[PDB]
Design goal:
part of a larger assembly, 4 chains, A alpha/beta, B mainly alpha, C alpha+beta, D alpha+beta, B: mainly alpha, 71% helix, C: alpha+beta, two-stranded parallel ribbon, 5 helices, 9 strands, 32% helix, 22% strand, binds phosphoaminophosphonic acid-adenylate ester, binds magnesium ion, binds zinc ion, helicase (chain A)
Chain lengths: 568, 17, 186, 299
């Protein structure tokens, strides 16, 4: 009762099993005292007691979970780490009852904020996939990784069997495809999430889990299999999956340099040779303009939509994969998952109908058996297609080469056609680059640095951070001086289009020009659109408009439009 | 106790800062 | 036992006495509702808090138990101002407390008054619930009755007038019912 | 009564957050201040989600225990000056109000209630109607108008705070040797500072910040704001003042200085306000006026 053991006395487990040794009163009191002495005393090399700092921030956020690193607990008082690995279900009870004392030492009357605190363990030093688990692991702490396949809704659950409740949720976990051996199906397990951990993860995420491995009797399993076979579940204890001023100053430094736009475009899709215009359009779409709206029933996208007609094998799928890896959030082929992200289409009636509604609106609506509901799309669409069989025909307008309605071509911001042209020098350049990249990728630190810096002019990590920063921070505006010139150019383009008998230019083209100019301003972190932005946007839209036309109309347009497509 | 002084220092820094 | 009477007395005195400037607003509302055959009362939380905070504290701690007592107090007041028969009146509330987003409701809020908002997406057809209900005892052919109220019941088994283990059946021929409906909020 | 901005309306958290004294004491314009407020509420034993509830609906137990909770905790944050005594009035069942809240409601109603010479005449005429919109609120029969006044007061303080943070973070205060200068060339909506009273509220905010930021150099301050319709700056000269808890009073000397420069200056200026410490001057003439002012020994 009164007397206590030494830490050296705990070196000898004296009972017949671990659990029957931890649960004894004197042993338990000794463990409680030692854990409290560890929590109040552990230090960084700089002093600077980490857990005093963490308990301080626990109250700053009104939180409920204290986090403890396993390596720290193993660095001193190792036997407690061993006992924790062997008997988590007891050790964590004692540890939580110590953590409440430690937190009340900082914040007296924190019991009125939350009645109970949970300790979360981190950096457990051994890992299994869902293959290696065996019966020996039962009731032991384990660390597991996989993809979350399915998720239930959150419910309350009775805590004690006056009443109290807690939150509850179950998650299905599956082996990551990269880990599965060849020629085998993936395995599955199910995880139980309790009070603080519910809705920590979403379906499709790749997740890492620490918890107890546990089992129970099930009548149906025994009935169907005909052997005394128990079912097993994992009870999670913890689950796992910004910038400084220095980054901001570096961004501003590179943006202050001339030609940053060209360098960003050059960095786009390093592995793919040529096709600069496609890279330009993709970069413009990834940055985008600013979404705007006007009472009196008008609205303007920030998102820039792009469509690309590819001859067979002209690098379309590779750039789409590159954009998938580059972009923050995206969908590859479901518009709900693309919210404020990029939507990617590589090939192509109900799907087209859905896309018609998606391009017409920015929100999707549906009804079923009396139910009515609405959803948001709010995304940039990049699409690619094969031009009506084996090969594009340049003698004909765009409509002959596609299976699309006119409003699709009307509502997309940028349209372009890519073709496998014949040239000895271009072929030699392509072949040399291809074999050079092939050798550079062969499986057989300095090598990586040389390889990286030769690959691109900008480190793509910095570019991705730059894109995220620009998208979150920069929101450019037009300057009112030169817009008289833009109106005159618009009128002139309409007049010339009518004069040759072309399909006319429209307000959609003007709106796209302004939005693309905002994107050019955003790319250099400029809050002001400038004359050169408008010039570049005009060139892009006019060239795209010219590419859609028949050959004679094309020649007349380019002869007249020379002061826009080339000059300004 | 001197060994646990860092913990209380982290506590007391809220008073100081 | 006495606590059920004091609470009803307190709410009865609340309805009969709350003036703001010169008009007994709730006596007037309760009279004006009866003339158009509307049996309900729309109380405002802030006025209840202003009158006596203890009553609001009791209401806030245990709503499921205390709402019926206030309803029967409304009936007892309703009879005095209009008779020298009426059903039980429905209480309706208005409040300005902070809205909880629908996504944040969890186990801490069970059996608490909650204010939220959203979009209605579906509506059920009407269905019947019982309030006053009559009972026939199968063996002895004795009869009795029960009064239901719709707050969070089953048929009893204490046989009366041996009389058997489960002798009770319902006389639907002499019972009273009300409407009920289900909705979905998104 | 507590020197907390409208305690008995809105919420306790907003009462601390927008208090003019608390901003100076804990530096709420940056995250390292706001975390102190979160830390205080954590130590006091008040759940942070209840601190943000409307003060009428906040739980009765916290209401009655608040008077003792402050005695144990405000010392650790150097914030003992919050406690004081004041007057409170109540009528029937409609709830209490203190004078300190009443005057804020009245001033809000004065401020926001609903070529060059004609526009100035229209503006000054509009400002006169608010006198009657406040006069009618001194009657117990018209509490409805007083509630509207309180609703306007909250928005006014919100807008003032959102401008003060922008002034401090961008470091627009220019530290001249003799006095501190600040000029607002642009803002989210600079029209609110065209009225004198709103401008003086912003000045009082900045004066508390400057008073507590450093022990040294109690200096006069000058604050100005442009108007795009007149192309004139509205200028005000403000004194320092000593902290609350601490002996003759000081005197504002900007009146004689502005009068002398006005008598001397080529500049196109106006002086007709009863408080002579506030003047107006055209866009191009601000810099020569201030140059002659700082050259003068009258400051
Ligand atoms: N610089 C390059 N230019 C063209 N092709 C390249 C280049 N680098 C690699 N390739 C290869 O050429 C193809 C690029 O075009 P891509 O569209 O991805 O092929 P594909 O998808 O099979 N053709 P398709 O089915 O019509 O989309 C791939 O097979 C690449 O391996
Ligand atoms: Mg392809
Ligand atoms: Zn019987």
């Amino acid at each position: 009762l009164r007397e206590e053991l030494t830490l050296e006395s705990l070196s000898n487990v004296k009972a017949n099993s671990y659990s029957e040794w931890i649960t004894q009163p004197n042993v338990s009191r000794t463990i409680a005292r030692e854990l409290k002495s560890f929590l109040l005393e552990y230090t960084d090399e700089t002093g600077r007691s980490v857990y005093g700092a963490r308990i301080r921030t626990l109250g700053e956020m009104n939180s409920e979970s204290l986090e403890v690193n396993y390596r720290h607990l193993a660095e001193s008082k190792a036997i407690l780490a061993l006992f924790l690995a062997k008997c988590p279900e007891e050790m964590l009870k004692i540890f939580d009852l110590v953590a409440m004392e430690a937190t009340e030492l900082h914040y007296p009357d924190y019991a009125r904020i939350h009645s109970e605190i949970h300790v979360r363990i981190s950096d457990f030093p051994t890992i299994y996939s869902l293959r290696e688990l065996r019966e020996s692991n039962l009731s032991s702490l384990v660390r597991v990784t996989g993809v979350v396949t399915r998720r239930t809704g959150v419910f309350p659950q009775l805590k004690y069997v006056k009443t109290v409740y807690r939150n509850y949720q179950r998650v299905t976990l599956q082996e990551a495809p990269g880990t599965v051996p060849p020629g085998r199906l993936p395995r599955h397990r199910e995880v139980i999430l309790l009070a603080d951990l519910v809705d920590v993860s979403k379906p499709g995420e790749e997740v890492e889990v620490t918890g107890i491995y546990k089992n129970n009797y099930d009548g149906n399993l025994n009935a169907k299999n005909g052997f005394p076979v128990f079912a097993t579940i994992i009870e999670a204890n913890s689950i796992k999956r910004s910038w400084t001023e220095e980054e901001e100053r570096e961004f501003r430094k590179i943006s202050r340099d001339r030609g940053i736009i060209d360098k960003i475009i050059s960095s786009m899709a390093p592995s793919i040779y040529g096709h600069r215009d496609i890279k330009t359009a993709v970069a413009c779409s990834l940055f985008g303009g600013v979404p705007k709206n006007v009472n009196g029933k008008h609205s303007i996208r920030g998102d820039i939509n792009v469509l690309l007609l590819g001859d067979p094998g002209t690098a379309k799928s590779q750039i789409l994969k590159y954009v998938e890896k580059t972009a923050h959030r995206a969908v590859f082929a479901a518009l709900v998952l693309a919210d404020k992200g990029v939507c990617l289409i590589d090939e192509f009636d109900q799907d087209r109908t859905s896309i018609h509604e998606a391009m017409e609106q920015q929100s999707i609506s549906i009804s079923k058996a009396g139910i009515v509901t609405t959803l948001q799309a709010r995304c940039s669409i990049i699409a690619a297609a094969n031009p009506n069989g084996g090969r594009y025909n340049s003698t004909l307008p765009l409509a002959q080469n596609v299976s699309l309605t006119e409003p699709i071509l009307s509502r997309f911001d940028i349209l372009c056609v890519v073709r496998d042209l014949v040239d000895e020098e271009a072929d030699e350049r392509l072949a040399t680059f291809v074999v050079d990249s092939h050798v550079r990728s062969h499986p057989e630190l300095q090598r990586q640095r040389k390889k990286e810096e030769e690959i691109s002019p900008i480190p793509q990590e910095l570019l991705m951070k730059y894109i995220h920063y620009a998208r979150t921070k920069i929101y450019p505006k037009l300057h009112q001086m030169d817009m008289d010139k833009v109106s005159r150019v618009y009128a002139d383009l309409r007049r010339e289009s009518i004069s040759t008998g072309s399909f006319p230019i429209t307000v959609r083209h003007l709106e796209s020009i302004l939005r693309i100019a905002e994107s050019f301003a955003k790319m250099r972190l400029s809050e002001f659109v400038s004359s050169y932005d408008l010039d570049r946007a005009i060139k892009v839209v006019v060239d795209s408009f010219v590419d859609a036309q028949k050959v004679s109309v094309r020649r007349q347009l380019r002869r007249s439009f020379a002061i826009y497509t080339l000059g300004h | 106790n001197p060994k646990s002084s860092a913990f209380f220092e982290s506590m007391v820094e809220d008073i100081i800062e | 036992d006495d606590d059920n009477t004091e609470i009803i007395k307190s709410f009865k005195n609340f309805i009969l006495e709350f003036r703001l400037d010169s008009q007994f607003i709730y006596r007037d509302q309760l009279r004006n509702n009866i003339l158009v055959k509307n049996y309900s009362l729309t109380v405002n939380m802030e006025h209840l808090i202003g009158y006596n905070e203890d009553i609001y504290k009791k209401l806030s701690d245990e709503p499921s138990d205390i709402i019926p007592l206030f309803e029967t107090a409304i009936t007892q007041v309703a009879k005095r101002i209009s008779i020298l028969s009426l059903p039980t009146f429905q209480l309706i509330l208005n409040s300005n407390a902070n809205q909880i987003p629908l996504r944040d409701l969890d186990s801490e809020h069970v059996s608490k008054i909650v204010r939220l908002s959203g979009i209605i997406i579906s509506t059920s057809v009407l269905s019947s619930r019982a309030t006053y209900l009559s009972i026939m005892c199968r063996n002895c052919r004795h009869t009795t009755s029960i009064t239901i109220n719709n707050f969070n019941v089953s048929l009893p088994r204490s046989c009366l007038s041996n009389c058997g283990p489960d002798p009770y059946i319902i006389i639907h021929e002499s019972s009273k019912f009300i409407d009920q409906q289900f909705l979905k909020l998104q | 009564d507590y020197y907390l901005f409208l305690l008995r309306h809105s919420s306790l958290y907003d009462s601390f957050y927008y208090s003019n004294y608390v901003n100076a004491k804990l530096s709420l314009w940056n995250e390292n201040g706001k975390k102190r407020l979160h830390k205080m509420f954590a130590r006091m034993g008040i759940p942070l989600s209840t601190a943000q509830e409307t003060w009428l609906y906040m739980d009765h137990s916290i209401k009655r225990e608040l008077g003792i909770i402050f005695d144990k905790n405000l010392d650790r944050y150097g914030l003992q000056d919050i406690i004081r005594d004041g007057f409170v009035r109540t009528l029937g069942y409609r709830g209490s109000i203190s004078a300190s809240e009443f005057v804020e409601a009245l001033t809000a109603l004065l401020e926001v209630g609903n070529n060059s010479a004609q526009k100035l005449t229209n503006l000054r005429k509009r400002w006169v109607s608010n006198f009657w919109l406040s006069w009618d609120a001194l009657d117990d029969r018209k509490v409805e108008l007083l509630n509207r006044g309180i609703q306007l007061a909250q928005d006014l303080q919100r807008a003032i705070f959102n401008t003060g943070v922008a002034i401090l973070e961008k470091k627009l205060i220019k530290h001249l040797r003799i006095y501190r200068l600040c000029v607002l060339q642009d803002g989210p909506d600079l029209d609110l500072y065209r009225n004198p009273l709103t401008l003086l509220r912003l000045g009082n905010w900045l004066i508390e910040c400057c008073a507590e930021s450093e022990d040294k150099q109690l200096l006069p301050m000058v604050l100005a704001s442009i108007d795009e319709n007149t192309d004139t700056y509205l200028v005000a000269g403000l004194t320092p003042r000593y902290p609350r808890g601490l002996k003759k009073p000081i005197l504002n000397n900007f009146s004689m200085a502005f009068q002398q420069i006005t008598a001397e200056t080529d500049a196109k200026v106006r002086i007709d306000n009863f408080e002579s410490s506030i003047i107006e001057i055209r866009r191009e003439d601000l810099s020569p006026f201030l140059e002659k002012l700082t050259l003068s020994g009258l400051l």
